[PDB]
Write a protein that binds this DNA or RNA. Structure first.
Ligand SMILES: Nc1nc2c(ncn2[C@H]2C[C@H](O)[C@@H](COP(=O)(O)OP(=O)(O)[C@@](F)(Cl)P(=O)(O)O)O2)c(=O)[nH]1
Ligand SMILES: [Cl-]
Ligand SMILES: [Cl-]
Ligand SMILES: [Cl-]
Ligand SMILES: [Mg+2]
Ligand code: NA
Ligand code: NA
Ligand code: NA
Length: 326
DNA sequence: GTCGG
DNA sequence: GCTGATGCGC
DNA sequence: CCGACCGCGCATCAGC
């Protein structure tokens, strides 16, 4: 929070480019700058000082000076005043409503939470659940609650098949004292890159979690990825906990390290690392790390036995999970 | 919007 | 039904 | 300049 003002501004600018302008590269340009500045161990004094960091160019440097001088940005002041931009930004806050759907709804006169509710008919399944738990999904999850949730998930999974291995990733694995949701990596020995020896591997876990009323809703569900809603159980007479977003990713057992690297993040860390990988002539996804031939085509998966092995291939000193929060 | 070649 | 492009989210 | 910007699972659609 050393340069909170500045990083907030860049984040607001990032969200505007993404939601309203549908300018994804500008979105990331601002996010990166916000990321690099949030990490800077000095209270920024000028745009020039900021322009020294990678990701901060002339435009952002200029904005930082305006912000430091006045304590605000005129460009953002006007963006806030604009009713169309405001409505669009708001609607994208509902899970399932992106920049396109948001702009479309606004074109129909649907601009508020009140409008969305009275128009459920115009929403697909995901958007309907996003609206249902709109308030809840805005809440942070204390680590203490993440710990209780982890205990339920691992124990329920164990009951389905002792050979299952569920690992909580995301910011939780990064040591955060609060998380925006729960990310669960799942593996089973019967599912590898070589073959699937048993079907419904993900389904059974989902099924079991619904049986005990932990999983309450489903946003989307496939053979290897579940996106849904869960809730901790509350005691007698006590207010029940808010509903939480939960994602479960089933990855081939022999590709765990690439999988846990991916799911631990952060997203920007993944983007930076995968970009660096490319520079070093490699390509990384949640399954493997492969070399890039002269042509530019991915070769065969390289051997991996730890997260560190991935970092070594691209000549990066190993970074613990707690230091990947970019 | 920023960067490297 | 399929394939592929697009939206959306991780 | 100017091209590059990470990589992919699921839901949905158009075109066949
Ligand atoms: N490669 C890649 N990985 C991504 C991307 N987005 C997410 N991931 C990976 C890396 C992410 O760590 C992981 C989980 O996605 P979240 O839950 O959205 O991210 P988080 O858990 O870190 C969080 F801090 Cl935003 P919290 O949920 O606590 O508020 O998915 C992306 O664009 N690209
Ligand atoms: Cl763009
Ligand atoms: Cl691996
Ligand atoms: Cl792969
Ligand atoms: Mg998360
Ligand atoms: Na710079
Ligand atoms: Na959204
Ligand atoms: Na998540």
């Amino acid at each position: 929070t050393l340069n909170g003002g500045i990083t907030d501004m860049l984040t607001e600018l990032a969200n505007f480019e993404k939601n309203v302008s549908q300018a994804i590269h500008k979105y990331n340009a601002y996010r990166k700058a916000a990321s690099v500045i949030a990490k800077y161990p000095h209270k920024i004094k000028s745009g020039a000082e900021a322009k020294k960091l990678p990701g901060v160019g002339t435009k952002i440097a200029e904005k930082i000076d305006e912000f430091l001088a006045t304590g605000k940005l005129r460009k953002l002041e006007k963006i806030r005043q604009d009713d169309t931009s405001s409505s669009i930004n708001f609607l994208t806050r509902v899970s399932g409503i992106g920049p396109s759907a948001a702009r479309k709804f606004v074109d129909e006169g649907i601009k508020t939470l009140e409008d969305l509710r009275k128009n459920e008919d115009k929403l697909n399944h995901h958007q309907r659940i996003g609206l249902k738990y709109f308030g809840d999904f805005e809440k942070r999850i204390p680590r203490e609650e993440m710990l209780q949730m982890q205990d339920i998930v691992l124990n329920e999974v164990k009951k389905v098949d002792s050979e299952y291995i569920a690992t909580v990733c995301g910011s939780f694995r990064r040591g955060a004292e609060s998380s925006g949701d729960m990310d669960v990596l799942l593996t089973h020995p019967s599912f590898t890159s070589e073959s699937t020896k048993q079907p419904k591997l993900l389904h059974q876990v989902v099924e079991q979690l619904q049986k005990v009323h932990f999983i309450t809703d489903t946003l989307s569900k496939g053979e290897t990825k579940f996106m849904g809603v869960c809730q901790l159980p509350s005691k007698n007479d006590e207010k029940e906990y808010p509903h939480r977003r939960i994602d479960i990713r089933l990855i081939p057992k022999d590709q765990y390290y690439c999988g846990v690297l991916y799911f631990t993040g952060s997203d920007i860390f993944n983007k930076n690392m995968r970009a660096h990988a490319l520079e070093k002539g490699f390509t990384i996804n949640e399954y493997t790390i492969r070399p890039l031939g002269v042509t530019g085509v991915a070769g065969e998966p390289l051997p991996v036995d730890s997260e560190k092995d991935i970092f070594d291939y691209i000549q990066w000193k190993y970074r613990e999970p707690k230091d990947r929060s970019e």
